[PDB]
Amino acid sequence: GLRQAERNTEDGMSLIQTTEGFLQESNDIIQRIRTLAIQSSNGIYTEEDRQMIQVEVSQLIDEVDRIASQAEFNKMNLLQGDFARGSRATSMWFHIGPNMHQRERVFIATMTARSLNLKGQSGELLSLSTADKSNDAIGTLDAALTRISKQRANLGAYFNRLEHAAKGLMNAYENTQASESRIRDADMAEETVAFTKNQILVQSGTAMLAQANVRPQGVLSLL
C-alpha cells in the first residue's frame, strides 16, 4: 500500500504540474492584453486604430477560451470548473496513504474567459474600441491576473505538500520493509550451522543404527 500510495502521489503531482503549465500560457496572454489596454488608452489613436488592436484582443480572448475548454489531463478537463469548490460535477481526491480514508481533496477553479470577466454573460467580449473603455479594462485584467496568480499559488502549495508526502511515504516504506524482513526473512548465517549440525547428527545416527542392527548376531555363536 505504501508503494502504491507513493505512485498515486506521483500521479497527482504530475496532474497539478500539467495544470500549472496550462495556466502559464493564460497568464502570459492576459498580461499581453493588459499591455495592449495600457497602450490603447493614449489619445493619439483614432477609432480605426483602436479597432485594429481590438481585433488582436478578440483573438487573444478566443485563445484563452480555447485553453480553458481544451486543457485536459487523462481524458478529464481541468480548467472548465468541474473540480471547483462548489461544483457538483465531480470531486478529485489523491489517495496518499496505504489504508482507507487516507485521501486529500484538491480544488481547481473555473478558468474560462467568462469567469475572468473578459466576457460578459451575454457573450460580449471585453471591448477596447474606446479610450475610456480601455481604462476600465485595466481593472478587469488586474482582477484576472490576481485570480490566475492565486490559482498558481494554490497549485504550488499542492506541489510542495505532495512532494513532502512522497518523501515521507518512501521513508515509511523503507522502514516498514526493513522491519518486515527483520521479522520474516531467515538468517542464512545461523541457519547453515543449524543445518550442518542436523546433517552431522543424521549420519551419526545411521552409523549407530547400522551398528545396532548387527548386534544380535553374537547370539548365534552358542546356538
Interface with a copy of itself (CB under 8 A): 10-11, 14-15, 17-18, 21-22, 24-25, 71, 73, 171-172, 174-176, 178-179, 182-183, 188, 202-204, 206-207, 209-210, 213, 218-219, 221-222
Measured torsion, CA atoms of residues 203, 204, 210, 211, in degrees rounded to the nearest 10: 160
Q: How far is 170 from 164, CA to CA, in rounded Å? A: 10
Shortest Cβ distance from residue 67 to a copy of itself (Å)? Answer: 10
Shortest Cβ distance from residue 106 to a copy of itself (Å)? Answer: 16
Closest by CA to 60, choosing from 131, 144, 135, 155, is: 144
Q: Give the nearer residue to a copy of itself in terms of CB position, either 123 or 218.
A: 218
H-helix or E-strand containing 17?
Answer: helix 2-40
Shortest Cβ distance from residue 171 to a copy of itself (Å)? Answer: 4
Shortest Cβ distance from residue 194 to a copy of itself (Å)? Answer: 12
Q: Give the nearer residue to a copy of itself in terms of CB position, either 90 or 213.
A: 213
- Residue 7 has which C-alpha cell? 505512485
Angle at CA of residue 89, ends 88 and 95, nearest 5°: 95
Cα four-point dihedral sign 151, 154, 155, 156: positive
Shortest Cβ distance from residue 18 to a copy of itself (Å)? Answer: 4
Q: Give the nearer residue to a copy of itself in terms of CB position, either 44 or 210.
A: 210
Q: How far is 30 from 24, CA to CA, in rounded Å? A: 10
Q: Give the nearer residue to a copy of itself in terms of CB position, either 134 or 158.
A: 158
